[PDB]
Every structure is written in structure tokens, then in C-alpha cells.
Design a binder for this molecule. Sequence first.
Ligand SMILES: CC(=O)N[C@@H]1[C@@H](O)[C@H](O)[C@@H](CO[C@@H]2O[C@@H](C)[C@@H](O)[C@@H](O)[C@@H]2O)O[C@@H]1O
Ligand SMILES: CC(=O)N[C@@H]1[C@@H](O)[C@H](O)[C@@H](CO[C@@H]2O[C@@H](C)[C@@H](O)[C@@H](O)[C@@H]2O)O[C@H]1O
Ligand SMILES: C[C@@H]1O[C@@H](O)[C@@H](O)[C@H](O)[C@@H]1O
Ligand SMILES: C[C@@H]1O[C@@H](O)[C@@H](O)[C@H](O)[C@@H]1O
Ligand SMILES: C[C@@H]1O[C@@H](O)[C@@H](O)[C@H](O)[C@@H]1O
Ligand SMILES: C[C@@H]1O[C@@H](O)[C@@H](O)[C@H](O)[C@@H]1O
Ligand SMILES: C[C@@H]1O[C@@H](O)[C@@H](O)[C@H](O)[C@@H]1O
Ligand SMILES: C[C@@H]1O[C@@H](O)[C@@H](O)[C@H](O)[C@@H]1O
Ligand SMILES: C[C@@H]1O[C@@H](O)[C@@H](O)[C@H](O)[C@@H]1O
Ligand SMILES: C[C@@H]1O[C@@H](O)[C@@H](O)[C@H](O)[C@@H]1O
Ligand SMILES: C[C@@H]1O[C@@H](O)[C@@H](O)[C@H](O)[C@@H]1O
Ligand SMILES: C[C@@H]1O[C@@H](O)[C@@H](O)[C@H](O)[C@@H]1O
Ligand code: NA
Lengths: 314, 314
Amino acid sequence: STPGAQQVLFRTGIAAVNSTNHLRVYFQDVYGSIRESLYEGSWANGTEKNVIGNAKLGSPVAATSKELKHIRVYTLTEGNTLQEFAYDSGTGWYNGGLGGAKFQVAPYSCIAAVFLAGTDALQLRIYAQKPDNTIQEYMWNGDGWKEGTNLGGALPGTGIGATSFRYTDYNGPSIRIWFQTDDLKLVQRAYDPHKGWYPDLVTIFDRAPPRTAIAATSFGAGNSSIYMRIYFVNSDNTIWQVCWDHGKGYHDKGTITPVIQGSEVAIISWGSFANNGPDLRLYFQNGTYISAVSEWVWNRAHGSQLGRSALPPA
Amino acid sequence: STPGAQQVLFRTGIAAVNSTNHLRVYFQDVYGSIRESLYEGSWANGTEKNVIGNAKLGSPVAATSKELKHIRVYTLTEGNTLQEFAYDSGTGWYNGGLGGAKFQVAPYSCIAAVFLAGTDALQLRIYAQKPDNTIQEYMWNGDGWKEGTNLGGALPGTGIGATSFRYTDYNGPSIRIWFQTDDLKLVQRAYDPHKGWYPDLVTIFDRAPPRTAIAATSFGAGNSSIYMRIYFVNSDNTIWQVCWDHGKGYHDKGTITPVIQGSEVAIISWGSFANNGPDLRLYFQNGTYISAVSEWVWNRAHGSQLGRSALPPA
Ligand SMILES: CC(=O)N[C@@H]1[C@@H](O)[C@H](O)[C@@H](CO[C@@H]2O[C@@H](C)[C@@H](O)[C@@H](O)[C@@H]2O)O[C@@H]1O
Ligand SMILES: CC(=O)N[C@@H]1[C@@H](O)[C@H](O)[C@@H](CO[C@@H]2O[C@@H](C)[C@@H](O)[C@@H](O)[C@@H]2O)O[C@H]1O
Ligand SMILES: C[C@@H]1O[C@@H](O)[C@@H](O)[C@H](O)[C@@H]1O
Ligand SMILES: C[C@@H]1O[C@@H](O)[C@@H](O)[C@H](O)[C@@H]1O
Ligand SMILES: C[C@@H]1O[C@@H](O)[C@@H](O)[C@H](O)[C@@H]1O
Ligand SMILES: C[C@@H]1O[C@@H](O)[C@@H](O)[C@H](O)[C@@H]1O
Ligand SMILES: C[C@@H]1O[C@@H](O)[C@@H](O)[C@H](O)[C@@H]1O
Ligand SMILES: C[C@@H]1O[C@@H](O)[C@@H](O)[C@H](O)[C@@H]1O
Ligand SMILES: C[C@@H]1O[C@@H](O)[C@@H](O)[C@H](O)[C@@H]1O
Ligand SMILES: C[C@@H]1O[C@@H](O)[C@@H](O)[C@H](O)[C@@H]1O
Ligand SMILES: C[C@@H]1O[C@@H](O)[C@@H](O)[C@H](O)[C@@H]1O
Ligand SMILES: C[C@@H]1O[C@@H](O)[C@@H](O)[C@H](O)[C@@H]1O
Ligand code: NA
């Protein structure tokens, strides 16, 4: 292993954001600090000098962005309230206002976050689990944090995946989120601006390990058309992928890569099938230098391939 | 799930002590507190009122006893120093002297603990991993804590199992410990009073998951004879057992029971083959009520069976 790799928490929460091929990756160190690694032509950072804040040890770690102009990172405090670390170009890193709302969640809650797509306005939806085990939406629309739609019960400690896209024939954004129910199914819930939250859950996978990681992305939005990918850790200790592709629906599922038992997972994407893409990047732990974070790549050039073996600070 | 099971930390460290079929089990709750559940005819406790102390979230939890007269429970402070909760009949619970020594270990260190067998005197040996990744022994011989023997390098974050027995033809106690080496092997190291720490590391399993749980017990000591069982979580997400039986050596290995990815493991035993025994109890998480602790049992009457489904507080 390496002294750097040893600083990375085993089964750390992982998140990532990007603007095309400009990448940032968030993780927790063994002391509970949240650090940023970065790719700008090459990999750097992830050191003690790249701490953005502190969270309870074992905290979920979620992140969302508008390119790399605005980045928001969500974790849990020792008190099990949602908090936010914020980057704005020209301002740098600071503590955003979510903390002030003191939103109290289950000790075992996960977190997902999205900027609403297709607008220059900064609008955010956060998902987490309340003590009664229901999934709660929290909203920022430029004038303070408020609760949004409660989306019903889930498995206590369920992973939460989430994405926002805007159809080019729609006048507003859509949201899709994914979690695990008590019966151990992985389900989709869905928001469109006409039907609101659709009443029904759609099953994406019959049986998954209890509290498995869940990470999602979407790309290539068109006229009432989208592409989506959802990832989880199956019982074979590999990440599995589920595809939505326009005109085919939920039509493909299969293993992608081996990981450590109980690895967390982050996904980013950019581009589209119509324009020589997409590009996908997955981050996870697979045992490289024991505790380092590893990368998986997909692009048109070469399809599925292992990427950076050990991320900084490894 | 159940509300009680929701209080138990996912992938909690687990330790267990006993006097024959009088049992105690220790675990961490979602807030970082170490709780005791109990079996005296039936299962009890493990509630907020049965907290014996606090430790960093995700701390290893080890325990050793002399029957139930003297119990010692070892975990890590937020500062990554070893600490001790102690019970003596007639006194109750108290924080033991161990914290006075300020032994600093690696933030990812595990812990094992044994009272030395075959003496009424209270002699302790604790094992953990220093920042240089070597396994260090720490000793109490009735007049203050100090470092004992350093047992060399091991995989960073390795599980550590230990047991002490005393052969009926020896003038003093033996120690066996087990851990994982950088090549992912599981190995034994050994202390006998004529050879001190043996020079050889003896391989007991060729390849195991990185940082897998390791728990060990021993029973039926005779003249130059002993029975040992070592447990670990294998890549198939089940506990495996390695057997030493007198006259056969390290002769068997196979699966015992399924567990969640990354489950920790605790083992106790009592009795002997020559006296209609032994009894074994194993403790772990297998997904019952998502996050409850479960029991597996072995005895002569019915052999291998699942015990109590979900321990208190579930
Ligand atoms: C000096 C400066 O740039 N201040 C910013 C304000 O002008 C702006 O209104 C706030 C908005 O709040 C932050 O971003 C939003 C999207 C949310 O994440 C919110 O929680 C966060 O505080 O940002 C600066 O203070
Ligand atoms: C029919 C047969 O071979 N039965 C044997 C018994 O003779 C023997 O007692 C038993 C030993 O089991 C081993 O030891 C116990 C304590 C436990 O660890 C088991 O997992 C081991 O296999 O094996 C029966 O199979
Ligand atoms: C954007 C870059 O794409 C590929 O070149 C990868 O090998 C790098 O790790 C990075 O993800
Ligand atoms: C968008 C910004 O990009 C670089 O300037 C980094 O140093 C910052 O931490 C941030 O990620
Ligand atoms: C995009 C939508 O915004 C508001 O109307 C919320 O109440 C909904 O739950 C959804 O997030
Ligand atoms: C992107 C697609 O949008 C709607 O048609 C949903 O009913 C589908 O499940 C899918 O989420
Ligand atoms: C963008 C790519 O789309 C399909 O070809 C999938 O089979 C790949 O796994 C990847 O998700
Ligand atoms: C010592 C006891 O043995 C069996 O009767 C089990 O069913 C109990 O859970 C307990 O372990
Ligand atoms: C040996 C002792 O037994 C009972 O008194 C319990 O209440 C204590 O916690 C301790 O385990
Ligand atoms: C056996 C001894 O008991 C008490 O004296 C504790 O304070 C010591 O640290 C040790 O565990
Ligand atoms: C029982 C023995 O006691 C002391 O002599 C120590 O130096 C050894 O390491 C061993 O623990
Ligand atoms: C109990 C046995 O004792 C010695 O013979 C060791 O060399 C063996 O490995 C085993 O631990
Ligand atoms: Na976690």
C-alpha cells in the first residue's frame, strides 16, 4: 500500500463532478475530513491540503455541479443533520446554507443531490431518509431551503441515486431517483413537469444486497428522449449496470467491474451517442493499494476499460 | 427492519465473552456507543440503558474475560488510542487504566485481546497495529501497562484474532494469534514458553479478502494437545472456518454461514470433545432486520444451526 492510500477511509462515501473531461472526486479520509482529488490533464491533490470540510465518520458523500462553476457537496454532521460545502468560481470553497435549516435525518441515511437541468438558475433538490424511513426531498429555489415532496418509505439505510435532465421539447426539468424497498428490490421514482411525481415505482432489479450503493447518471436528452445508467453493488461483489436507452426502455443489465465488499460508487458522464460519446467514469474501491479509490472508463474509442488505478493521494 | 435493529451500526465491530452458556455480546450503535446484550437463560438488554462507553464510529471492538468475574472491552478513541472498559464482580463497570498509557495506533487498526490461560492472576495481552503497520503486543502483568513483543508487518487494517490456552503438561500459558499479510494470505503466529514467539508464520488460508474479519477460539487443552477454530469472511460473502484438531493439525476448511458484505465476526466456545462438547457460538450480521446481529450455534446434539435470529435490541 502507500501512506497516501492509507489516508483513504475503507468503504468511504464517494462522489464526483465534471465539465466534460475536467474531473473532481470527493472522498472521506480516515480522520473524517472530506477531500478533493482533481483531473486537469493529469491527476493531483487528495492531500491534507485539499480538505473542504468535516463530516461524521462513515458519512454519505454526494456532489452535484453546474460544469465546474458551481459545485455542491453534501454530507452528514455528527448530529445527523444535512450540511453543504459550496464552491463558486471567484469565491472558492465555503459553507453553504443548508446547515442553517438543521434538517434532521436518520443516522443511517444516504444522500443524493442534483442541480435541476436546462436552466441557468441555481436550483437544487436533495434526497435523504427521515427517521420514519421515508425518502424526503429538500429544495433550494434561490430564496432559502425548504422541504419538498416526500416520496414514501424505503429500506432503512437505502442507497439513493438521482439525476435531472430536460427534454428538448419540454418547458421544464425532469427528475429520476432510485432506491431500495423493504423487499430488497431496486426501484425508480419519476418526476415530469406534467405528471408530477408519477404514482408508481418501476422495478429496475429484482433483488439486491441490503443497503447496497446506488449511483445514477443521464445523458443525450432529446425530444421526449433520454439515456440513463444506474449502478449498484450486487452480491457477487461487482458493480452492475442497468441501462435505459431511448426506444428500448430498461433493456440491459450486467456486471461491470469487481469491487471490495460494501464499496460505495460514483458515476459521472458527458456527451452523447449522436456526437461521438458518451463518456462514462465510475469511481469505487476495488482493493488497489488496499484502500485506494479506483476508476473505470467507457468511451466510443475503446468501450469498457479500467482507468486510473489509484487516485491521488495514493 | 425493526426500530431496535435500526440502532445497531451497519458493519459494527462485535465481541463476545462467556462462562459456559452465560453470554455477553458487545457492539456499537449508530451514535458511537458500545452496548452490551446478555444471555442468562434468555436474551436481554442492548438498549440505550446498557451503554458501557463510547468509541470512534466504526471502531474495532474486542473483549476478553475470566468467566464473567472479570470482563475487559477494548476499542479506539477519536484520537486513535487504545482504551478499556472493565467489569469486576462487586465493583461494576469502570474505565480501566489502559487509556493512561496513550498507546497510539493506526487509524485503521483492529484489536484482539486475551487473558492468559491457566492462572488465577490477571495478565492481559492486547494486539493492535501501529502506524508503521506492524502488529504490536501490549501487556498488563498487575503493575502497569507496557509494550511487549512486536510481531512484525501485516496488511494495513488487517483483522486480528487471538486465543490463549495452557497445556496440562506445560508450566505456563501459550498464545496463538492470526492476521493477514500484504499478499492477502491469512497466517498464524505462536507463543509457547520454551520457544517464545516462534519464528515461522504458518499459512492457514491462501488468499482472503483485504481487511476481512478474523476471529479465533480454542478449547479442550490436554497434554501437548489443543483444538482451535479460526473464522473469516471469504470472497463468497460467507464465514469460513479453519480447523486445528489434535493429531490432525490444520486439516479442514469450509463455509459456515452467509453474512453481509463486510460483516465483522465474534466467536466464543466452552467444553470439550471428551466431555460431550464443545459448544460454539458465532456472532455476525447476515441481513436479518437489515442491521441486527445474528447467532450461529454448534453443539453435539444437533450440530450446526442458526441460533437467535436477531439479538437484543432487535
Ligand atoms: C458573495 C457571493 O457570491 N455570495 C453568494 C450569494 O450571492 C448567493 O445568493 C448565495 C446562494 O447560496 C448558496 O448557493 C445556493 C445554490 C445553495 O447551495 C445555498 O445553500 C448556498 O448557500 O451564495 C453565496 O453566498
Ligand atoms: C459423522 C461425523 O463424521 N461426525 C463428525 C463428528 O464425529 C465430530 O464431532 C464433528 C466435529 O466437528 C468439527 O468441530 C466442531 C466443534 C465444529 O467446528 C464443526 O464445524 C467442525 O466440523 O464433525 C462431525 O462431522
Ligand atoms: C478524462 C480522463 O480520461 C481518461 O484518459 C482516463 O484515463 C483518465 O483517468 C481521466 O478519466
Ligand atoms: C472548480 C475548482 O477547480 C479548481 O480550481 C480546484 O482547485 C477547486 O478546488 C475547484 O474544484
Ligand atoms: C421539480 C419540482 O419542483 C417542485 O415543484 C417540487 O415540489 C417537486 O417535488 C419537484 O422537485
Ligand atoms: C426516462 C423514462 O421516463 C418515463 O417514460 C418513465 O416512465 C420511465 O421509467 C423512464 O424513467
Ligand atoms: C455508454 C455505454 O452504453 C452501452 O453500450 C453499454 O453497454 C455500456 O456499458 C455503456 O453504458
Ligand atoms: C447458550 C444458548 O444456546 C442455545 O440454546 C441458543 O439457542 C441460545 O441463543 C444461546 O446461545
Ligand atoms: C458480568 C455482568 O453481568 C451483569 O451484571 C451485567 O449487568 C453486567 O453488564 C456484566 O456483564
Ligand atoms: C486487569 C486490570 O484491571 C484493572 O486494574 C484495569 O484498570 C487494568 O487496566 C487491567 O485491565
Ligand atoms: C506471555 C509472554 O509474556 C511476556 O514474556 C511477553 O514478552 C511475551 O510477548 C508474551 O506475551
Ligand atoms: C497448536 C499448535 O502448536 C504448535 O505445534 C504450532 O506449531 C502449531 O501451528 C499449532 O498452533
Ligand atoms: Na458509510
